[PDB]
Motif scaffolding. Sequence first.
Motif, PDB file in Angstrom:
ATOM      1  N   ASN A 109       0.821  -1.202   0.000  1.00 38.83           N
ATOM      2  CA  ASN A 109       0.000   0.000   0.000  1.00 38.83           C
ATOM      3  C   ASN A 109       0.857   1.255   0.000  1.00 38.83           C
ATOM      4  N   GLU A 110       1.895   1.292   0.835  1.00 35.11           N
ATOM      5  CA  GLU A 110       2.813   2.420   0.835  1.00 35.11           C
ATOM      6  C   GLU A 110       3.742   2.401  -0.370  1.00 35.11           C
ATOM      7  N   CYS A 111       3.797   1.291  -1.099  1.00 35.46           N
ATOM      8  CA  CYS A 111       4.667   1.196  -2.257  1.00 35.46           C
ATOM      9  C   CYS A 111       4.200   2.136  -3.363  1.00 35.46           C
ATOM     10  CB  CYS A 111       4.714  -0.237  -2.784  1.00 35.46           C
ATOM     11  N   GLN A 112       5.174   2.732  -4.046  1.00 31.66           N
ATOM     12  CA  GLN A 112       4.919   3.619  -5.170  1.00 31.66           C
ATOM     13  C   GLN A 112       5.340   3.010  -6.501  1.00 31.66           C
ATOM     14  N   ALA A 113       5.693   1.730  -6.522  1.00 36.50           N
ATOM     15  CA  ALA A 113       6.167   1.062  -7.723  1.00 36.50           C
ATOM     16  C   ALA A 113       5.442  -0.265  -7.909  1.00 36.50           C
ATOM     17  CB  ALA A 113       7.682   0.833  -7.667  1.00 36.50           C
ATOM     18  N   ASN A 114       5.914  -1.037  -8.884  1.00 32.58           N
ATOM     19  CA  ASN A 114       5.309  -2.321  -9.229  1.00 32.58           C
ATOM     20  C   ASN A 114       5.849  -3.386  -8.283  1.00 32.58           C
ATOM     21  N   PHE A 115       5.293  -3.427  -7.078  1.00 33.69           N
ATOM     22  CA  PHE A 115       5.729  -4.383  -6.066  1.00 33.69           C
ATOM     23  C   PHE A 115       5.072  -5.729  -6.337  1.00 33.69           C
ATOM     24  N   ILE A 116       5.874  -6.720  -6.694  1.00 34.05           N
ATOM     25  CA  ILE A 116       5.381  -8.072  -6.918  1.00 34.05           C
ATOM     26  C   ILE A 116       5.704  -8.915  -5.696  1.00 34.05           C
ATOM     27  N   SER A 117       4.974 -10.014  -5.544  1.00 37.12           N
ATOM     28  CA  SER A 117       5.139 -10.911  -4.414  1.00 37.12           C
ATOM     29  C   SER A 117       5.285 -12.344  -4.902  1.00 37.12           C
ATOM     30  CB  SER A 117       3.951 -10.815  -3.453  1.00 37.12           C
ATOM     31  N   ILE A 118       6.185 -13.085  -4.261  1.00 35.55           N
ATOM     32  CA  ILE A 118       6.381 -14.491  -4.592  1.00 35.55           C
ATOM     33  C   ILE A 118       5.311 -15.315  -3.891  1.00 35.55           C
ATOM     34  N   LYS A 119       5.165 -16.572  -4.296  1.00 36.70           N
ATOM     35  CA  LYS A 119       4.245 -17.506  -3.665  1.00 36.70           C
ATOM     36  C   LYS A 119       4.942 -18.843  -3.464  1.00 36.70           C
ATOM     37  N   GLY A 120       4.948 -19.321  -2.224  1.00 37.66           N
ATOM     38  CA  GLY A 120       5.630 -20.548  -1.892  1.00 37.66           C
ATOM     39  C   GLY A 120       4.913 -21.770  -2.423  1.00 37.66           C
ATOM     40  N   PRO A 121       3.632 -21.619  -2.752  1.00 37.55           N
ATOM     41  CA  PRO A 121       2.861 -22.774  -3.229  1.00 37.55           C
ATOM     42  C   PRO A 121       3.138 -23.096  -4.687  1.00 37.55           C
ATOM     43  N   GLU A 122       3.458 -22.075  -5.479  1.00 36.44           N
ATOM     44  CA  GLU A 122       3.691 -22.241  -6.912  1.00 36.44           C
ATOM     45  C   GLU A 122       5.167 -22.399  -7.244  1.00 36.44           C
ATOM     46  N   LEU A 123       5.942 -22.986  -6.333  1.00 36.59           N
ATOM     47  CA  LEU A 123       7.385 -23.060  -6.521  1.00 36.59           C
ATOM     48  C   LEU A 123       7.779 -24.026  -7.635  1.00 36.59           C
ATOM     49  N   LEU A 124       7.222 -25.234  -7.639  1.00 34.88           N
ATOM     50  CA  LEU A 124       7.695 -26.300  -8.511  1.00 34.88           C
ATOM     51  C   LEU A 124       6.559 -26.834  -9.366  1.00 34.88           C
ATOM     52  N   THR A 125       6.917 -27.572 -10.411  1.00 32.18           N
ATOM     53  CA  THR A 125       5.965 -28.176 -11.329  1.00 32.18           C
ATOM     54  C   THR A 125       6.319 -29.641 -11.561  1.00 32.18           C
ATOM     55  N   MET A 126       5.316 -30.413 -11.983  1.00 32.71           N
ATOM     56  CA  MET A 126       5.535 -31.819 -12.299  1.00 32.71           C
ATOM     57  C   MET A 126       6.355 -32.014 -13.563  1.00 32.71           C
ATOM     58  N   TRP A 127       6.219 -31.128 -14.544  1.00 36.47           N
ATOM     59  CA  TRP A 127       7.025 -31.216 -15.747  1.00 36.47           C
ATOM     60  C   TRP A 127       8.496 -31.022 -15.403  1.00 36.47           C
ATOM     61  N   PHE A 128       9.343 -31.817 -16.045  1.00 34.81           N
ATOM     62  CA  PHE A 128      10.765 -31.833 -15.733  1.00 34.81           C
ATOM     63  C   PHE A 128      11.396 -30.490 -16.084  1.00 34.81           C
ATOM     64  N   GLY A 129      12.058 -29.872 -15.109  1.00 29.75           N
ATOM     65  CA  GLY A 129      12.798 -28.652 -15.363  1.00 29.75           C
ATOM     66  C   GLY A 129      11.962 -27.397 -15.462  1.00 29.75           C
ATOM     67  N   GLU A 130      10.650 -27.500 -15.264  1.00 35.56           N
ATOM     68  CA  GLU A 130       9.788 -26.337 -15.409  1.00 35.56           C
ATOM     69  C   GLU A 130      10.005 -25.303 -14.316  1.00 35.56           C
ATOM     70  N   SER A 131      10.577 -25.705 -13.179  1.00 36.65           N
ATOM     71  CA  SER A 131      10.709 -24.784 -12.057  1.00 36.65           C
ATOM     72  C   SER A 131      11.608 -23.606 -12.394  1.00 36.65           C
ATOM     73  CB  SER A 131      11.247 -25.524 -10.834  1.00 36.65           C
TER      74      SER A 131
END
Lengths: 753, 135, 110
Positions: free
Chosen positions: A513-535
Amino acid sequence: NRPNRLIVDEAINEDNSVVSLSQPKMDELQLFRGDTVLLKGKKRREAVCIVLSDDTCSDEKIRMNRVVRNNLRVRLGDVISIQPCPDVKYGKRIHVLPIDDTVEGITGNLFEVYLKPYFLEAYRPIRKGDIFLVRGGMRAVEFKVVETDPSPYCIVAPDTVIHCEGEPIKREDEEESLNEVGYDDIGGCRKQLAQIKEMVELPLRHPALFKAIGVKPPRGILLYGPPGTGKTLIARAVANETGAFFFLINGPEIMSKLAGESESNLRKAFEEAEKNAPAIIFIDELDAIAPKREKTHGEVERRIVSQLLTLMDGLKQRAHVIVMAATNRPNSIDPALRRFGRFDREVDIGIPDATGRLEILQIHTKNMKLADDVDLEQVANETHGHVGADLAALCSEAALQAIRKKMDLIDLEDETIDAEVMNSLAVTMDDFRWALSQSNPSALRETVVEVPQVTWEDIGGLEDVKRELQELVQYPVEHPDKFLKFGMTPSKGVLFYGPPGCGKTLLAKAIANECQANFISIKGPELLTMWFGESEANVREIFDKARQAAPCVLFFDELDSIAKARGGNIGDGGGAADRVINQILTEMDGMSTKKNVFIIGATNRPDIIDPAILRPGRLDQLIYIPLPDEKSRVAILKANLRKSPVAKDVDLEFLAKMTNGFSGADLTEICQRACKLAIRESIESEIRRERERQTNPSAMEVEEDDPVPEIRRDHFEEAMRFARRSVSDNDIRKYEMFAQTLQQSRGFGSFRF
Amino acid sequence: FFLINGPEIMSKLAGESESNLRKAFEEAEKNAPAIIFIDELDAIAPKREKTHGEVERRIVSQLLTLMDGLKQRAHVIVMAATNRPNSIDPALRRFGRFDREVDIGIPDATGRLEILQIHTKNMKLADDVDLEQVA
Amino acid sequence: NRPNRLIVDEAINEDNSVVSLSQPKMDELQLFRGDTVLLKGKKRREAVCIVLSDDTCSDEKIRMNRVVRNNLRVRLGDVISIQPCPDVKYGKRIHVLPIDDTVEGITGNL
């Protein structure tokens, strides 16, 4: 005129198109009144020279009438050479085509009205969309001339057989022609754009220079630019500005279903363009789509690609050929043409800078309303996140929001649509800011979806942390000055090693909210994928999106989860994840520009942290935030009370004293429980009052009858009796041990002699 | 109205669906200030990013050419009928079809009850059908 | 539109096709016998209606009747004045086609 340009500000004459013949202008250029020397204006500009020499009264300045500048779709102050140009030649029979918005309503015969107005304002402007001083007929008689090569400016002579207007020229087509796409209409990365634009032009403007060089020029470069940046639009506008035998191409038409029909059509188009004049074509990332006989198995597509490559790179390909390539895939994987000679050059395009953003915004606003209520400079300075076509769409959205407000602020206005009211609407900095808050970058628009975020004012405590965050934000605004002074780069981000589970998402939301730029956030749930090497592919995509969207932040959610303490201990998935994490860290630290990022991470514990990522450089900073204090407890209580019915019945200081540094979330929950109890009591009281269904007209002296319009200290005591105090002493010891380990490396004195 | 089913826009001949779509768009533009209904548009393409289908890439190029055309909408409305309001579709990847989303007031919640009431009030004579059961 | 809400009351005339004009429309619409009084309405409405205005007695409410609203397809309070007939275009061969309802129920041929 000359490199010494004519200062066309205020002509000595006050007619519509009269150049003030300066002593220098009338002398160096023999600009007499009868001298109808065609001024070398802009966009094929030529006319009859209305000499306005007035050197006898004051110093005659070389100035053209401001009405001429407004008419000719130009600006007052341009350079124009006073010589008889062929753009207004001599002609015997010149075609005359009165416009539909001009022929309709005109009085008398077209020839009768025209010959009456033929002598009037003969030295008027005949430039691109030039409005000549065609006054007469008691109507807006726009003398829509063919402006043909033979006598575009018709001299008043009976020899000029006025050919009948075989078609009344519609005003929409005239507006579209006036609403043309010019080379200066783009702006932005002019430094890069001119490098290719002048390269193309000088080869035609000064082909003798190319001959003297002894080296041929390029056959058309490839525009390796970010897609949808207006890059397609920018290329189209540049082609429109250029006066060449251009023939753009599209992939859809480039895909025929017959036997070699597409390749034959492409060859025919290339041949026709070469036979025509200076060839100019536009391509859409079909070479990234070219398999190179290696990427894909589509031979017909591969065959077409090879035939096109031979046509563009073959034995005596073409002269006066400009193969402009628009790389819709910016990372166009074209192993065939994307090289020396096969491709002429590679134009790199993308997002603009803040100055470029301001330029594009000014360009967009130039065709817009007054926008006086809106501060364009401040908006552009604030609008450091969106760029290019995104900025243009943002301007359109601001206009739409202001228009929707004004139309809503008025009635339908279908009977009296006050154009004065519409102009006064203009644009509000309020409306512009409302749209800007509504607006967001297109890349994030497909990437992230924010939720409500309370301001740093709602954030309690962490005054030093708030100051550090503010300093980091201000670093973006004045870091040029800091680098100029010292020469030191800033840090990336800090690991908010807060108390375990105390809630750092609150801090992240407050920052955003106090940010004045394009503040993005990571998500720990979307870290890895079943496809090989997709991470790492996901990691690479995230890092690339962040690098594109500077300034930016990366709120690393579940920082411990990605950290994985050591990384690569057991399990094939574990090893692959460790490799992906290491690759992500290396991408982060580092072999790149690292324009504006923020590594905001909160982990369970320092032990849960990745030992390599925890190392400096890989870790820029860290925030080993402890648990709440009594003063912090009071601050949190006040923040909670900011939206609640308060009372003095329960003492906040006594609550803090009894807290003994209990969890602030526990305090918030206790407040919520007390509020729920009070609300239930109020509902029960209302139900009881309703049970006596209006037994008296004045049965309720307080119509609301708020039983707990304030805080019941009884509710507070009851919540305290059912308190949580989730501060685990073992967890306290663990966090304390981690902090003590961190502080063991800390500790320094003045170290000053 | 120009209903354009996404499945109907799937063809074995590369470009045939794209050429047909371009021809239909041009015919509608020449016809009137028409309205195009891009049915099943969300699944009609993968935005040629997730999928390696050259046919998908060609369709995307045709759309960026046809849907994003130079004044190609003479008072014409390209209404993209997305399969799901929140589906992250090809146009989510390529926000050029929705190069501008209109601030338009979305539906209601009793609109189910309201629509049922309208249908019963359209031609139905089910007087004994209780409105409470409908709600 | 105008800020004053138009009162949707009963029309002075019983018939839906016949309505009473307001005070400003009592004499604004010229009554011509040789030329049909085509009132400018909604959806290219060129209707040859009467200029019968109840404004000579009192301020007649600007409101359509029960069937006039579905007839003219115009909202209540909409301004309708006597203007040139836009739905009446004279041409070289301008003939009105018949319909089954025009044929069915009528004596003889349509």
